[PDB]
Amino acid sequence: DKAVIARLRKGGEEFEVLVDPYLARDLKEGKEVNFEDLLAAEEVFKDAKKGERASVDELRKIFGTDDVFEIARKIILEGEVQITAEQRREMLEAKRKQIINFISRNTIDPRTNAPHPPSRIERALEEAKVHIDIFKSVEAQVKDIVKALKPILPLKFEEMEIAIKIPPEHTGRAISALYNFGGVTREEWQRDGSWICVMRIPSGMYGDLMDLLGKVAKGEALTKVLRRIG
Helix, strand or coil, rough: CCCCEEEEECEEEEEEECCHHHHHHHHCCCCCCHHHHHHHCCCCCCCCCCCECCHHHHHHHHHHCHHHHHHHHHHHHEEEECHHHHHHHHHHHHHHHHHHHHHHHEEEEECCCCCCHHHHHHHHHHCCCCCCCCCCHHHHHHHHHHHCCCCCCCCCCCEEEEEEEEEHHHHHHHHHHHHHCCCCCEEEEEECCCCCEEEEEEEEHHHHHHHHHHHHHHCCCCCEEEEECC
């Protein structure tokens, strides 16, 4: 009873599969999913609660194939995943969090070129009554959300390129930490033991980069803002 029914009406018939609701959510978002884990039974049902299985001949007729994996994919994508009220709440809470974190990191308020705390984006989501879609990725719904937020919270998606030089003593620590932060481009070791790159980062993550650099090169790293990319 961990599995939930996903259901699709096709050609005057009902078809059901029994799936892990989180992995089904992942598939509808466009993530890669392990079908052996997704499916609780490798079967298409006419009625899963009664154990009435769909015949191979009916599947070929309606779906054009008898492959349970391909048919499960269609049912999940085109049909309805019957998650519980408590799964839905939990998924909604997790998705809203990811949206909030992504907006906070990938935008700046043009009233300092700085980023709103998560808490301010959260209140703004409440106040504009933004619909959160649990079966879409952040990336696929965030444009629409930011547009619903424009009236009461102004936000621009901005990136920056920032030239970095790390002196020879501090490379062992700094380089590896910068790759871990992400955004390293045009990296070049220098004959004197130093190393340079251009970091391409979400403008909301500037202050976080600058703190990382303080830590890992003890305030000896040199930087230069090359451009902001609106």
